[PDB]
From a paper:
Here, we show that NmMetQ is a [name] (lipo-NmMetQ) that binds multiple methionine analogs and stimulates the ATPase activity of NmMetNI. The overall architecture of NmMetNI is similar to previously determined structures of EcMetNI, comprising two copies of each TMD and NBD, encoded by MetI and MetN, respectively. Each MetI subunit contains five transmembrane helices per monomer for a total of ten transmembrane helices per transporter. Using single-particle electron cryo-microscopy, we determined the structures of NmMetNI in the presence and absence of lipo-NmMetQ.
Reasoning that increasing the nucleotide concentration to above the Km for MgATP would promote complex formation, we mixed equimolar lipo-NmMetQ and NmMetQ in the presence of 5 mM ATP. Under these conditions, we were able to determine the single-particle cryo-EM structure of the complex to 6.4 Å resolution. Despite extensive efforts, we were unable to improve the resolution of this complex. Our model shows lipo-NmMetQ docked onto the NmMetI subunits and the NmMetN subunits in a closed dimer state. No clear density was seen for the lipid moiety of lipo-NmMetQ or ATP. A comparison between NmMetNI and EcMetNI in the outward-facing conformation in complex with their respective [name] proteins reveals they have similar conformations, with RMSD of 2.2 Å over 1048 Cα atoms. In contrast to the inward-facing conformation, the NBD:NBD arrangement is similar for both EcMetNI and NmMetNI. Our structures show lipo-NmMetQ binds to the TMDs of NmMetNI, similar to what is observed with the well-characterized E. coli [name] methionine transporter system, EcMetQ:EcMetNI. Under these conditions the ATPase activity is low, showing that unliganded lipo-NmMetQ is not sufficient to stimulate NmMetNI activity. Given these findings, we conclude that NmMetNI ATPase activity is tightly coupled, requiring both L-methionine and lipo-NmMetQ for maximum stimulation.
Residue numbers in the entry:
A (entry chain E): 44 to 284
B (entry chain C): 2 to 243
C (entry chain A), E (entry chain B): 5 to 226
D (entry chain D): 1 to 245
Write the structure that this text describes.
């Protein structure tokens, strides 16, 4: 048997459509547990209600493993949502004003990517050299353009275009609102936030985990992922492409 | 005031308060007190509701101050309802408004001027004397007071008929002597044509004009009580007299 | 231990003052519209099924099955379905006003089913007396039935407010605003043990107060 | 015997309670006799009748019942004593969603008697009143007179030691009443003849009481034996009550 | 588009039955406890509110405050706080049984408060009569509280059942419980309008069936 934790959506979709049938061909009975809350999947992993979980990214594992002193490890990177800035009430970047509005995810680590991208736009400056994995409003050295940030739930970001000037879209909701996924004004080159499968550290060598890793690196899985998650930021194992 | 006819009837385990009220009719003349008498329940503890059409009968029709009532539309029936007064076996009142305010209530429905209501309540409260504790609530006073509240409530709107359901008979006879004196005056001055139910002979002999004696949803006799003497003819009537 | 005193007071004051303001307006306004329109509908439910003032078997059946559907259908899902209509009315999808709208729709249908109790429970014979004295149906309801069940209406509004408080926290995470929109920032995500105990304390004191107000007035108005 | 002793119920300056204050008062009732109680509603139809059960407590005074003080018992023993004493009430207070035959069974369920002796006593006291025919009927099948018999039957079932009435036949007819009172006289054949009762009227009292008391505003103005259906009142203001003849 | 929608639905066949099979356990089981302990709590509050049994002013006030504190305390936060205790008792925190425990906890207080309406609102006379008869408080609960008020209790049960259904959507997120999880799938993450309309219709049926059952029971009791 093998027990998986994912969030709902793209990572649980990877398990439901392709990886689950792949491991059953390989003799493993998979159980999927789906989460809508970030805290429960890791605890359940360290507590052994799960054998594995692909929802954690490199920054999140480090906070939660430190804070809760957990016996867990990453194992391999997985295809990850690009992040990108999109037209809202304003249609091109140059239109930005003192007091313009931007919609962004309320997640601490995805807020950290957003902050790193607005510094790459040069709209704000962050205190460069401060921890990137845990950046926040206080890590804004200067709100150069006095931008009015709007923290939201990520699935609301596609509808927010009408309400805010420009709207960062997580990328998990850009390609499901796929009709507008092409309209990105900016793109994310940061590799500090890659998604990463994870296990209890004692599990790291197990043949079942090697067969999960192989399923996650099988040619059938690559064919399925290219087809289902087009434009996602690949594992460095895939040459990041 | 006359019935054409009435009746109302119930199947086995249809089970309203009593078994059927039978084919029946009467004329109650103007300026006349008319009594109803007989063993308990029996549809007689209900029968008077049929006059105000508060139960619709299974049969027949009724005329009151000219108008036949059963044919009326509900909005016309309001004025018929307004001009005919009634009082009951239970006190049937608005808990969360005062005594004086319960007395004002029908007059609010009369649409009377504020001072006309105030005057009429002060009048009717004083006629029953209970002006002395009218700023009051039902836990504060007793059933005797509450009878006078019913009486005044019925009285105040100057209705052309009253349909008493043992309100003055409800008290014990010694207490009743001081109140019965009121109804006599009300009849003499306004020819109220007051109709009353009872299960006690004594009150009839000391108040009324004609008595229907009754059983099984039907008449035993109608008798004159004039001369303070009930001139009955049946042995059932004699038992009811005793 | 002083870590706890410092961590909260310096930062959180600035947000708390807004998070509170958003919370109160969202509960208050939604409650008003819920009690207002819910009253009228509750009356209709009763007076159609009363068979005394008026009757209609069919309208009664239709309105009940409607009310049933809307009372039980899930609120969060209904809010997502109501976003286009909401934006078209409010002029935007985001803020306490937009939440107050969807909250009020749930509260509207919530309210009326309660009041059904408040009427079926009441003593019969005074109704017959009102009919015996020939009042219009509108007068009966307006200037009798409320006062008779006055203590009953205070209880119902008290409990509805407490419900809408829990509902407002759920409404706020998706739409923005409210102490729920704080708690998810300092719990569920970036969880902090000391900040969570302060929000818990504020709730306790506020929710005693509203109920204690309700019980005092309801007691006065027997 | 019963002894009634300096009993009072003083209220507040507002005096917004059920009635006006009631004064320190005392009497003695015997094993062999029927006692009637009479005044105007100004004194209070309730009078101190609820306090006899100790639904209230004397602000002055005390209460011997069957020769035993009740204000001192002050325990589940006082409730147990209450179970043993008969009363009927101005308000029907019947359960609505059980048959009146099961409202008749309800007092014996309190006594905890074996259910067979419950069935027996029930049918006995129910057919003594003659309401056995309309016992199975719920309260939407009745008038006041049926409901009265129900209260009366409910009271009778224990063969209780001592008896209290509350202006019962104000809304009832003579031959049922006559027969009921003839049953109470048969209860005198049983251990006790004590039948305490309120009616402010004369008609009943003149017909069948042994003794009686005349009162206003919590003052007793005379007690009178009744003989040959005559009161023989000595009291002047009592004679204002006797004018009600 | 119609044929595309219809042909799609056939694919989800087994998953739908597994979501529904889950849902009955959460709602049914949690309801039982809610009605059970909520009864005792409401009764105990009421008897200490009255001179019947024993009148305890202080105990009454403290217990009343506790019920208000727990109803108004937020559901989602409470679930997250309950994690360590829930894990020790059930042997897990994932799944419908663990979630139903948390549902039921909220339900105890909500049901006791609902019970309180019905208890405080009875007509005095019969209580006064049995008390005059020297009856013990056990007999008073054994029949006297029930005889009429049991219809209002069917009403209370009916609203409670419908309430636990809405909360089951919210627990559906974390516990992966039944139709709440199903509505989180192909909802915010993906937009499949066809299965939304199907879920709406499936719920609509359940709603009508529940309230129709409640309505009939309450009608037949009096």
């Amino acid at each position: 048997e093998i027990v998986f934790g994912t969030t709902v959506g793209d990572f649980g979709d990877m398990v439901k459509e392709q990886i689950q049938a792949e491991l059953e061909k390989k003799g493993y009975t998979v159980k999927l547990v789906e989460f809508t809350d970030y805290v429960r999947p890791n605890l359940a992993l360290a507590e052994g209600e799960l054998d594995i979980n692909v929802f954690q990214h490199k920054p999140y594992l480090d906070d939660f493993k430190k804070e809760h002193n957990l016996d867990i490890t990453e194992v391999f990177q997985v295809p990850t949502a690009p992040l990108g800035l999109y037209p809202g009430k304003l249609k091109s970047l140059e239109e930005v004003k003192d007091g313009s509005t931007v919609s962004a995810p309320n997640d601490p680590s995805n807020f950290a990517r957003v902050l790193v991208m607005l510094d790459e736009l040069g709209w704000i400056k962050l205190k460069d050299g401060i921890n990137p994995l845990t950046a926040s409003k206080a890590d804004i050295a200067e709100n150069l353009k006095n931008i009015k940030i709007v923290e939201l739930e990520a699935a609301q970001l596609p509808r927010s275009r009408a309400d805010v000037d420009f709207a960062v879209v997580n990328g998990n909701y850009a390609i499901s609102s796929g009709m507008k996924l092409t309209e990105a004004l900016f793109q994310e080159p940061s590799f500090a936030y890659v998604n990463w499968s994870a296990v209890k550290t004692a599990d790291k060598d197990s043949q079942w985990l090697k067969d999960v890793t192989e399923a996650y690196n099988s040619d059938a899985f690559k064919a399925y992922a290219h087809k289902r998650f087009e434009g996602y930021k690949s594992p460095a194992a895939w040459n990041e492409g | 005031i006359i019935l054409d006819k009435v009746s109302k009837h119930y199947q086995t385990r249809d089970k309203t308060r009593f078994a059927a009220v039978e084919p029946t009719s009467l004329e109650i003349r103007d300026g006349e007190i008319f009594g109803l008498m007989g063993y308990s329940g029996a549809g007689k503890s209900t029968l008077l509701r049929l006059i105000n059409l508060l139960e619709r009968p299974d049969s027949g029709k009724v005329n009151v101050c000219g108008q036949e009532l059963t044919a009326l539309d509900a909005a016309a029936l309001r004025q018929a309802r307004q001009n005919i007064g009634m009082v009951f076996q239970q006190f049937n009142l608005l808990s969360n408004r005062t005594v004086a305010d319960n007395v004002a209530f029908p007059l609010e429905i009369a649409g009377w001027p504020s001072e006309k209501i105030k005057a009429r309540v002060k009048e009717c409260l004083e006629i029953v004397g209970l002006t002395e504790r009218a700023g009051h609530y039902p836990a504060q006073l007793s059933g005797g007071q509450k009878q006078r509240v019913g009486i005044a409530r019925a009285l105040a709107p100057k209705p052309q008929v009253i349909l008493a359901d043992e309100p003055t008979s409800a008290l014990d006879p010694a207490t009743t002597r001081s109140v019965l004196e009121c109804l006599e005056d009300i009849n003499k001055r306004f020819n109220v044509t007051i109709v009353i139910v009872t299960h006690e002979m004594s009150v009839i002999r000391r108040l009324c004009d004609r008595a229907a004696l009754l059983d099984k949803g039907k008449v035993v006799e109608i008798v004159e009580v004039r001369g303070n003497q009930i001139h009955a003819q049946s042995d059932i009537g004699r038992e009811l007299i005793r | 231990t002083f870590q706890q005193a410092v961590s909260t007071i310096v930062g959180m004051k600035d947000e708390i003052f807004r998070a509170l303001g958003e919370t109160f307006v969202m509960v208050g306004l939604s409650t008003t519209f819920a009690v207002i329109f819910g009253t009228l509908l509750g009356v209709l439910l009763f007076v159609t099924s009363s068979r005394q003032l008026h009757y209609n078997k069919l309208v009664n059946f239709l309105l009940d099955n409607l009310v049933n559907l809307m009372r039980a259908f899930p609120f969060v899902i209904l809010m997502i379905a109501m976003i286009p209509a909401t934006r078209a009315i409010v002029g935007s999808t985001i803020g306490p006003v937009a939440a107050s709208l969807v909250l009020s729709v749930s509260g509207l249908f919530y309210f009326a089913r309660l009041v059904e109790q408040n009427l079926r429970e009441v003593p019969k014979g005074v109704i017959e007396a009102a009919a015996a004295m020939g009042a219009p149906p509108i007068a009966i309801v307006c200037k009798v039935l409320l006062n008779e069940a006055r203590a009953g209406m205070v209880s119902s509004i008290t409990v509805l407010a407490i419900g809408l408080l829990s509902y407002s926290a759920a409404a706020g995470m998706i739409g923005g605003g409210g102490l729920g929109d704080l708690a998810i920032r300092y719990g569920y995500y970036r969880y902090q043990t000391e900040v969570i105990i302060f929000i818990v304390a504020l709730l306790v004191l506020l929710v005693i107060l509203i109920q204690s107000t309700g019980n005092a007035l309801a007691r006065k108005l027997d």
